[PDB]
């Protein structure tokens, strides 16, 4: 376990655990090494082995088959008081929160490419039976050479279901008004709300709401110049009534979403 990887410096820590940069010695592959304390684990799941693992491990295995816009789980290990997760590490990389901090409001062409890739990654999770429950710019990595976005941190996720959720541990300022008001939500429509928050974040340079009262107020003020078509998509994603929000298909068929850049064009035009 400590002989398969060379351990580098802390990339960060927080509600997810402590995450370290690392190198797989078998082939010098860059990895990220995440430690989670068993005592902090809320939801437990099981896999085919019937082995009892954190839910986060269950969800990562379900989305890690094949290529996608999700950071893949390469291995994991159980220790006395913790689990250790070996995850992909793009290099060079910046998370979308720091990217928006340094660059400000993104050009619509660039927000379109990013938002499209986030939609494809979330659709992939949903195809695999996985609800992420914490979509935000902090949980998105940008591979700056390939121009590809990658979703991280499934620590608040769940199996996707069609009945109501009554628990939530994701980020409150991205959570929907029906959660704020009634402590209930359905998975896809709550995901769509957080994608509205994220899109506003990208084209305006910060999220629209900080306080419960703004979240349930249903008023979107645009602080940057944003095209009418983009404003319409955002306001649709942020409809107060869940049933009034677009499906993923309606988002991707929206007129603002047409003629997206390829990932490599995005890197060359905006990131190199």
């Amino acid at each position: 376990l400590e002989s398969q990887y060379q351990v580098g410096p802390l990339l960060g820590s927080g509600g997810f655990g402590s995450v370290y940069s690392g190198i797989r010695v078998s082939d010098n592959l860059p990895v990220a090494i995440k430690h989670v304390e068993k005592d902090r684990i809320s939801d437990w799941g099981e896999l085919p082995n019937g082995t009892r693992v954190p839910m986060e491990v269950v969800l990562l295995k379900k989305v890690s088959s094949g290529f996608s816009g999700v950071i893949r789980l390469l291995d994991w290990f159980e220790r006395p008081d913790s689990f250790v997760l070996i995850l992909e590490r793009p290099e060079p990389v910046q998370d979308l929160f720091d990217f928006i901090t340094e660059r400000g409001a993104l050009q619509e062409e660039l927000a379109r490419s990013f938002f499209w890739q986030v939609l494809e990654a979330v659709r992939h999770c949903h195809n695999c039976g996985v609800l992420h429950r914490d979509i935000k710019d902090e949980n998105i990595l940008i591979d700056l050479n390939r121009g590809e976005l990658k979703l991280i941190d499934f620590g608040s996720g769940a199996l996707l279901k069609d009945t109501v959720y009554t628990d939530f541990d994701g980020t409150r300022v991205y959570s929907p008004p029906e959660w704020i008001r009634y402590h209930r939500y359905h998975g896809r429509s709550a995901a769509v709300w957080s994608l509205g928050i994220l899109l506003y974040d990208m084209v305006c340079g910060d999220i629209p709401f900080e306080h419960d009262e703004e979240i349930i107020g249903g008023q979107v003020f645009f602080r940057q110049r944003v095209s009418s078509e983009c404003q319409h998509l955002i306001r649709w994603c942020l409809a107060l009534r869940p049933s009034d929000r677009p499906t993923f298909e309606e988002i991707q068929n929206h007129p603002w979403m047409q003629d997206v850049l390829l990932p490599q064009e995005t890197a060359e035009i905006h990131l190199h």
Binding site: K136, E138, D169, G170, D206
Partner: peptide, 9 residues
């Protein structure tokens, strides 16, 4: 205007 990270988990 103050932009900040927000915790979860």
């Amino acid at each position: 205007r103050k932009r900040r990270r927000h915790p979860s988990g």
